[PDB]
From a paper:
In contrast, mammalian complex II catalyzes the reverse reaction in mammalian mitochondria, where it acts as succinate-ubiquinone reductase (SQR) in the aerobic respiratory chain. Since fumarate respiration is the major pathway of energy metabolism during adaptation to a hypoxic environment for many species of parasites including adult A. suum and bacteria inhabiting anaerobic environments as well as some human cancer cells exposed to low nutrition and low oxygen conditions, the pathway is one of the most promising targets of chemotherapy for both parasitic diseases and cancer. In spite of the similarity in amino acid sequences and three-dimensional structures between A. suum QFR and porcine SQR, flutolanil specifically inhibits the enzymatic action of A. suum QFR.
Two very promising hits, NN23 and NN28, were found. The IC50 values of NN23 toward A. suum QFR and porcine SQR are 0.0055 and 111 μM, respectively, indicating that NN23 inhibits A. suum QFR about 20,000 times more strongly than porcine SQR. This is a significant improvement in both potency and specificity for A. suum QFR as compared with flutolanil. The structure of A. suum QFR in complex with NN23 reveals that the trifluoromethylbenzene ring, like flutolanil, interacts with the guanidino group of Arg 76C. In addition, hydrogen bonds of the carbonyl oxygen atom with Trp 197B and Tyr 107D are also preserved. On the other hand, the tert-butylphenyl group, similar to the isoprene side chain of the bound RQ, occupies the channel between the quinone binding site and the exterior of the A. sum QFR molecule, making contacts with Leu 60C, Trp 69C, Met 70C and Val 77C within a distance of 4.0 Å. This conformation allows Leu 60C and Trp 69C to establish contact with each other as is observed in the RQ binding form, which might release the possible energetically unfavorable strain caused by the binding of flutolanil. On the basis of this structural investigation, flutolanil analogues showing higher potency and specificity toward A. suum QFR than flutolanil were found.
Numbering used by the authors:
A (entry chain C): 34 to 186
B (entry chain B): 33 to 282
C (entry chain A): 30 to 645
D (entry chain D): 28 to 156
The structure:
Amino acid sequence: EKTPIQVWGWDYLMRQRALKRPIAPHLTIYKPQMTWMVSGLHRVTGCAMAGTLLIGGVGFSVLPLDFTTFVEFIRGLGIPWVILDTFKFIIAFPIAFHTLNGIRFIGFDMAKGTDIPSIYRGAYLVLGLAALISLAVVVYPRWERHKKATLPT
Amino acid sequence: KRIKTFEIYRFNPEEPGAKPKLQKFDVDLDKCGTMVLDALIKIKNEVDPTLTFRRSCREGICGSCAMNIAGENTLACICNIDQNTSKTTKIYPLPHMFVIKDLVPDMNLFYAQYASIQPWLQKKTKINLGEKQQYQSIKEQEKLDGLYECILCACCSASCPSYWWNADKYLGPAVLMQAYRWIIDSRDDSAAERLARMQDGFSAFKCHTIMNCTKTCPKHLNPARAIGEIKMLLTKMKTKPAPLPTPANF
Amino acid sequence: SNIAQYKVIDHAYDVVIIGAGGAGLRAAMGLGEAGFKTAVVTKMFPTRSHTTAAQGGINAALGSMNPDDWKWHFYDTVKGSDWLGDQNAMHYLTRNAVEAVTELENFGMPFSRTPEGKIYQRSFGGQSNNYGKGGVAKRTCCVADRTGHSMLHTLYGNSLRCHCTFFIEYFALDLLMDKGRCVGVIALCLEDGTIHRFRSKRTIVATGGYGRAYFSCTTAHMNTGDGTALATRAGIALEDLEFIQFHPTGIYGVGCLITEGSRGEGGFLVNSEGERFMERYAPKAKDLASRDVVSRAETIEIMEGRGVGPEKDHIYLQLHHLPAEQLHQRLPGISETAKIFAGVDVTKEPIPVIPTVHYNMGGIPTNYKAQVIKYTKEGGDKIVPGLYACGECACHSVHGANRLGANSLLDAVVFGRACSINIKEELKPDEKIPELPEGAGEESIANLDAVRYANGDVPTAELRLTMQKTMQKHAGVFRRGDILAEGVKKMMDLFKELKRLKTTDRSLIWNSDLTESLELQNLMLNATQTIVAAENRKESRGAHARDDFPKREDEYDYSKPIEGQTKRPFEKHWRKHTLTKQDPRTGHITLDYRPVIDKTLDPAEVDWIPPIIRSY
Amino acid sequence: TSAAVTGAAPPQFDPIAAEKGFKPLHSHGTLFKIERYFAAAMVPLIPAAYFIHGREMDLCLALALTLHVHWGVWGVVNDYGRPFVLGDTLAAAVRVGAYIFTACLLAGLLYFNEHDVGLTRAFEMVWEL
Ligand SMILES: Cc1cc2nc3c(=O)[nH]c(=O)nc-3n(C[C@H](O)[C@H](O)[C@H](O)COP(=O)(O)OP(=O)(O)OC[C@H]3O[C@@H](n4cnc5c(N)ncnc54)[C@H](O)[C@@H]3O)c2cc1C
Ligand code: HEM
Ligand SMILES: CC(C)(C)c1ccc(CNC(=O)c2ccccc2C(F)(F)F)cc1
Ligand code: SF4
Ligand code: F3S
Ligand code: FES
């Protein structure tokens, strides 16, 4: 159900359609900025994590393949470790970023740090920590594994 | 000589089967004022009088000349021409608006949405209209700084992707900041009713904190902040303070 | 309608208002409140109107800063006018000011505030306490540096409460006349190219000024005198057009106004010797002298070699001695504008400024009730039935030969309100909306068609530019008989070049080539009439200064006592209004003259103010 | 010529006439409040899941992610599922499909947690690679 202005606005959209007027371009011409790109990344990371959870949970259930034979399959391909650890980074970054930037967006909801300097600092900060955390979580255990392979007892 | 190229969106609604185009024009920066509007005027005057755009004031106070220049919503009349003659400047209408002609969008939904916030002073107790000044403290009227300066240009709303997709139901940054302007005015008694007009899932809550509005505002205002403030009032995290009492001797 | 076919659409309204600036919107509010079906026809969204560019403030004796009296504001207005203003109108203006400004605050206008929570007021040019014997007045009420913006947005918002119907981006072509009675308006709808005839019991012209007649102005591109042109084409003589206000401080480069409020708050003008020279031209009021005097002063400094900048052709407005908190609190708008348009930080550097065409005290003549009038010597003032005018397009005359700062926003609200009051009182629910005469508006459509398809060799933009440069050179700050006469010749020749007009855009939908060409025709009527009025007026009064006639020419020599003198007859002196009557086809102008009204509306409430010698 | 037709008023939103009989719509404020509190509450959950694993954490994640994602995709569907571009019936259908999304998400997660390795161990197994 609609407010009167929302009803008025529907009838407006239909008038403009009837007039066959074009819509001025938008996504294809607007300057990429730390405002709407980070927002976009927030939505993409959110939805990618969701989509992965759906396709994963239902997929494995509907298929004969289970996750243990899936993991063993890709080890079987024996692909270089730097690339394996990049996949891990990619898996980790969305979680890191989306969580961090989620906190930022809740602040925006409460009218916190909406001045342009703060908008930009927070963006860079959130992208930075997210990358730093995803890096750590991948690198640290790889470090331990190199120590286990080449150091005594 | 310094020849700057502009690529300008064109659209002629009277030609049958007309499509929008991009038209390059060359302009001598040494024979033209420093602002993009100057170039638009020079082109219209000296090359192509069919070039059509809105303009009026010369100092960025009217709001008529809003458009998208080099990817950003701004006012042609106070946007310095980029003097790097090796790059072209693209000029498009305000994004995701229905175009009437060339750089002239249909603005009537924006205006109708402004009307819907009831942008006028409302009193619970009828007032004798010419009789006396209402009391307002310095601190209270200064809450309106950042708010009253809006020139209703629509750069912010035409920068907002949520407004791009759902203009018919989402009021957009410009109208929401004005709605807030009437809500935090200590002289206005209708704060609760003003809030209730945009209680639904779309009117104000379809702000997804994208922040393009505050970023692009040519008057350096902050619609984003005002929407956060509306969200707080709507979620009852905050209230409107009561008016300061009018002194006995006033 | 010769070559194309036009979709014509008919409307029926109690009143049509042409204009949606301060005046048109205030009128509309009063009429809608009184239940009249009201159409607002405006060639741009209301809020783009030039009112919105106004900065410095609006006068009313609220007494927020010190005691005050509306009669003191009256006095300054009359003296301001240089005794060419009609005192019954100036009385009406100043008597109603406190109430008008209080209304605006009551509508929600966010006026700056004093510590007591009252409307903050600043000083301005040419105003005083105790009938000119006291000190400098402070009755200029303001929303910082943005009072016009704030007033217009307030008025527009309030007009939405009163069910007026808005026809936005409709360009008015002519008044619809039936035997000397105005029965409506005809306009072009830009959105769809349709032509609209508005039938109305009354019509209010509230169309602003014609600053764009000149090469350099502070005014919007839209200030093309369309209203005064409409009146001319309706057979109505225009009044006092030679009286053009040059504002002292337009930014040197581009013409952007820098408010007089900057001087009001303590700024001052400096020449190339670092001298505060207004102390020499006006030892009492100094930089807060009237606008005609300050602008003349600056221009003399330039002539006599004390101009500033690389070409020694302008003046400095110094503000940097003021505290940064005051500059930001009181003058934020021009602070930003000076930075964008001159690269100047006002806390540190002066603003380069020069006198710039700014306001038109001339326009459509009305009586004090804002009813448009025609005048003959034999019959006196006769109202044009159906037709009112207010705002800058009018000549009430509340400004006479020189408009006082902050009186025009006042003027627009007060007389815009007056229109609604006078219409409610004199218009009865018995009178029926008139039927249009056959063929009504058909000539306006024919002119539209011919301009739209114009075929000649002189494009509208060249012709506009020569008009503007011509006016700048020949009808400037200081004028002279031979320069004016040469100006008249060039201008009446340019009027002839209109037949050679070239346009290119053939469309009907949002054709600004077409609308700007209509505006050029409109501007030529105003300009041609302005300069011939200026050529004939052999005196120096207010904003009109003749080097070959340096004195103000009244019924008496007011520089000497009155006892003993014999009065000069009307035909010998110049304390009288110019009426210019133009034939729109041929461009031929005849001149008549109409007496100044010296009486007030009520001698029991306020005394009329006899002329004296005008000094600040 | 001016052999003409009678006009009507332009389309114009009358804020007073539109207000006649307008009973306010239910307030989305409280729902919006909880959505954000919930998201804040999940902030500690994500690092907690890094340090503590097993089937009970797997269950906490499944439930919290499902609720959060429910509200999430519902907002996405309402942004892009626009009647203007899809028509009324297809728009309605994508609104329903958001609930089908949530339902299927949880069911597949419960499956995964109950008959496969579970979320936390799944991460271990990829990280060990
Ligand atoms: C830069 C600047 C600053 C100023 N500052 C101050 C100040 O601080 N204080 C003060 O008292 N005064 C000031 N003035 C003077 C004052 O603002 C104006 O004289 C006054 O506001 C004019 O009001 P108006 O309603 O008569 O006309 P405007 O506000 O100019 O409105 C004209 C209206 O008529 C309409 N119109 C015109 N032609 C047509 C047509 N053909 N068809 C349809 N519609 C038409 C327009 O669309 C517009 O809505 C200033 C002037 C300028 C230029
Ligand atoms: C850990 C802390 C998390 C926080 C604080 C958080 C916060 C948020 C917030 C505030 C939004 C709203 C964005 C908007 O409306 O503009 C959002 C959206 C979303 N989140 Fe999360 N989130 C978190 C974790 C997750 C996780 C783990 C997923 C996994 C699938 C997820 C999926 C989504 C989705 C799909 C949206 C969609 C809505 C949109 O883009 O607007 N979130 N999140
Ligand atoms: C992923 C990429 C292609 C870069 C992209 C980025 C940004 C957009 C525009 N953003 C959006 O559409 C958007 C993004 C996040 C939240 C809400 C929205 C909304 F629906 F409200 F607009 C669209 C597309
Ligand atoms: S906020 Fe800034 S951008 Fe949005 S309208 Fe008001 S001025 Fe234009
Ligand atoms: S860009 Fe749009 S989504 Fe909200 S913060 Fe500004 S309004
Ligand atoms: S012309 Fe007025 S804002 Fe640009």
